[PDB]
């Protein structure tokens, strides 16, 4: 795990990355290379980056949401589907690429790409519907009061 305190402080969000490496002299698999060497080291193909996610317990969640008043105010006005719209469009784009690959594969190593594409589509649609549900709840809570 590699952290970057300076960018974390200057950007307001944590900069973290988890990585794993390949065996010595094993797996040399085959605009991308230029940026890849620009932001990674010279050994771009020698290691890969895991997808980092965070979690918390129920007591931790309760204590955090009950710590300051700025955490339930920011939930009733979080306004999703606009904070991270660009991430949604990127997810739709690489979803389209994955669907094209699955269509190519199913016409004729053994991974069943269609199932993974469907899982990704269900995930992103579920985030979209969650955002819409938050907006609907906010509208029913605030707009539909006092005529």
């Amino acid at each position: 795990v590699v952290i970057d305190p300076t960018r974390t402080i200057s950007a307001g969000k944590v900069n973290l990355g988890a990585f794993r490496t390949y065996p010595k002299g094993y797996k040399p698999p085959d605009t991308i290379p230029l940026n890849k060497i620009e932001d990674f080291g010279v050994h771009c193909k020698q290691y890969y980056a895991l997808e980092v996610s965070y979690f918390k317990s129920s007591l931790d969640r309760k204590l955090l949401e009950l710590l300051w008043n700025k955490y339930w105010v920011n939930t009733l006005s979080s306004s999703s589907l606009l904070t991270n719209a660009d991430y949604t469009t990127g997810q739709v784009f690489d979803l389209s690429e994955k669907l094209e690959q699955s269509e190519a594969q199913l016409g004729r190593k053994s991974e069943d790409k269609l199932a993974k594409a469907t899982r990704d589509s269900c995930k992103t649609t579920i985030e979209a519907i969650h955002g819409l549900m938050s907006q609907v709840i906010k509208d029913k809570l605030f707009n539909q009061i006092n005529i």
Binding site: I37, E38, F40, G41, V42
Partner: protein, 345 residues
């Protein structure tokens, strides 16, 4: 020391002697010098003592076969590169430019009131020559008018340029009208001023010469010593050995009226006479780790930003540090760009 010796060989070769080698064999021995030159592992040091040797050769007009000088630097330029011979190219071009400048100045003199002495000057250039104004000097009353004249000629031709005359490296010729016969001696500007001080009176004390010429103590003492060596200034006690005579600002030195040297071309102007690298390497490796892919110019700028604020390192030292770090396989060149480094640990 061997590079220095080879360069002194070069000096003889090009300088000047009683016998002038023919142009055919002059390049023949120069080719042999370049045969061993490439074998020399370190090239930077050779330019260091070649610059001052060449500067003394040209500023005194003691160089022989100036055409061979052009070909000599021409051979060097294709050997190591433009950057290695950039400073020496300035020295040769300054001599050629000033030689043309003298011809136009003479023509300008005829169309106006002529001078009283034959005046020639080498303009040189600032920033490329090792010389610098180091000794204060009072301009003699006889060498002032021509002085001003040339300044005018250098103000109408070139605007925005300021001249800084170097009296230490200036020579001249002085005629006499009071000796037994008509003599014509050669002396530097300092000796000329000292000998022209005696134009109106007979004897002066040392302090009376120091306050009239404003020359500093050491150079003035040396000039008086060499003048006494030429037995042109005679002390009161003739029998005292000149070398062991202790000079004080009270002796009344008088011009030797009875000078009777047989030669009429007396030449009294005879000449006289690690830790940082580790810091640069550390700065380079740190900058390379921070910026994974960099250009040579950007790397130089970053090194100057981070480290040059401390001791102002020289750019060739940083380039050599980059080369040795490349040899240590700390950072590698990238194909497709001549000047591009990637931090390969």
């Amino acid at each position: 020391k061997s590079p220095e010796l080879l360069a002194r060989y070069c000096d003889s070769l090009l300088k000047k002697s009683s016998k002038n080698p023919e142009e055919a064999e002059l390049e023949d021995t120069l080719n042999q010098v370049m045969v061993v030159f490439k074998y020399i592992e370190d090239k930077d040091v050779f330019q260091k003592f070649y610059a001052k040797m060449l500067a003394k050769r040209l500023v005194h007009q003691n160089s022989a076969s100036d055409d061979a000088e052009a070909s000599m630097i021409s051979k060097l330029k294709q050997a190591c590169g433009f950057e290695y011979t950039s400073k020496l190219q300035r020295m040769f071009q300054d001599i050629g430019v000033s030689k043309d400048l003298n011809e136009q100045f003479k023509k300008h003199l005829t169309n106006s009131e002529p001078l009283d002495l034959d005046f020639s000057i080498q303009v040189l250039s600032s920033g490329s020559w090792p010389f610098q104004q180091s000794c204060t000097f009072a301009l003699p009353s006889e060498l002032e008018r021509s002085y001003q004249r040339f300044t005018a000629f250098y103000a109408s031709r070139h605007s925005g340029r300021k001249l800084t005359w170097l009296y230490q490296l200036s020579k001249g010729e002085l005629v006499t009208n009071c000796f037994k016969n008509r003599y014509t001696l050669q002396a530097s500007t300092f000796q000329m001023a000292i000998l022209l001080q005696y134009n109106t009176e007979d004897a002066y004390t040392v302090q009376q010469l120091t306050d009239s010429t404003q020359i500093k103590m050491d150079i003035l003492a040396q000039v008086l010593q060499i003048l006494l060596k030429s037995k042109l200034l005679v002390l009161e006690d003739e029998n005292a050995n000149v070398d062991e005579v202790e000079l004080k600002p009270d002796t009344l030195i008088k011009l030797y009226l009875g000078y009777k040297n047989k030669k009429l071309r007396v030449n009294i102007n005879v000449p006289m006479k690690e830790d940082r690298k580790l810091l640069i390497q550390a700065a380079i490796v740190r900058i390379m780790k921070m910026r994974k892919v960099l250009k040579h110019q950007q790397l130089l700028g970053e090194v100057l930003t981070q480290l040059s604020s401390r001791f102002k390192p020289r750019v060739p030292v940083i380039k050599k540090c980059i080369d040795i770090l490349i040899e240590k396989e700390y950072l590698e060149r990238v194909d497709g760009e001549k000047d591009t480094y990637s931090y390969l640990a």
